Amino acid sequence: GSAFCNLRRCELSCASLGLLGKCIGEECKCVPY
């Protein structure tokens, strides 16, 4: 595809829980660090 997910759009959304995020295409996943 020509377009992909933003890292802030996962790192902020996982910081709402209290941890870091990483994003693949559109799917955001949270990690402890």
From Swiss-Prot:
The answer, when asked if Disulfide bond is one of the entry's keywords, is: yes
One molecular function GO term is: ion channel inhibitor activity
This protein's domain notes: Has the structural arrangement of an alpha-helix connected to a beta-sheet by disulfide bonds (CSalpha/beta).
Q: Which organism is this protein's natural source?
A: Hottentotta tamulus (Eastern Indian scorpion)
Q: What S-S linkages are listed for this chain?
A: 5-23, 10-28, 14-30
Q: Where in the cell is it found?
A: Secreted
Indicate where the modification Tyrosine amide is found in the sequence: 33
Q: Which family does it belong to?
A: Belongs to the short scorpion toxin superfamily. Potassium channel inhibitor family. Alpha-KTx 05 subfamily.
**Source domain of life:** Eukaryota
Q: What is this protein called?
A: Potassium channel toxin alpha-KTx 5.4
Taxonomy of the source species: Eukaryota, Metazoa, Ecdysozoa, Arthropoda, Chelicerata
* Functional note: Blocks small conductance calcium-activated potassium channels. Shows activity on KCa2.2/KCNN2 (IC(50)=0.0243 nM), KCa2.3/KCNN3 (IC(50)=1.7 nM), and KCa2.1/KCNN1 (IC(50)=42 nM). Induces cell death when tested on human T lymphoblastic leukemia Jurkat E6.1 and human breast cancer MDA-MB-231 cell lines which constituvely express KCa2.2/KCNN2, but not on human peripheral blood lymphocytes (which do not express KCa2.2/KCNN2).
Tissue specificity field: Expressed by the venom gland.
As a miscellaneous remark, the entry gives: Negative results: does not show inhibition on KCa3.1/KCNN4 at concentrations up to 50 nM.
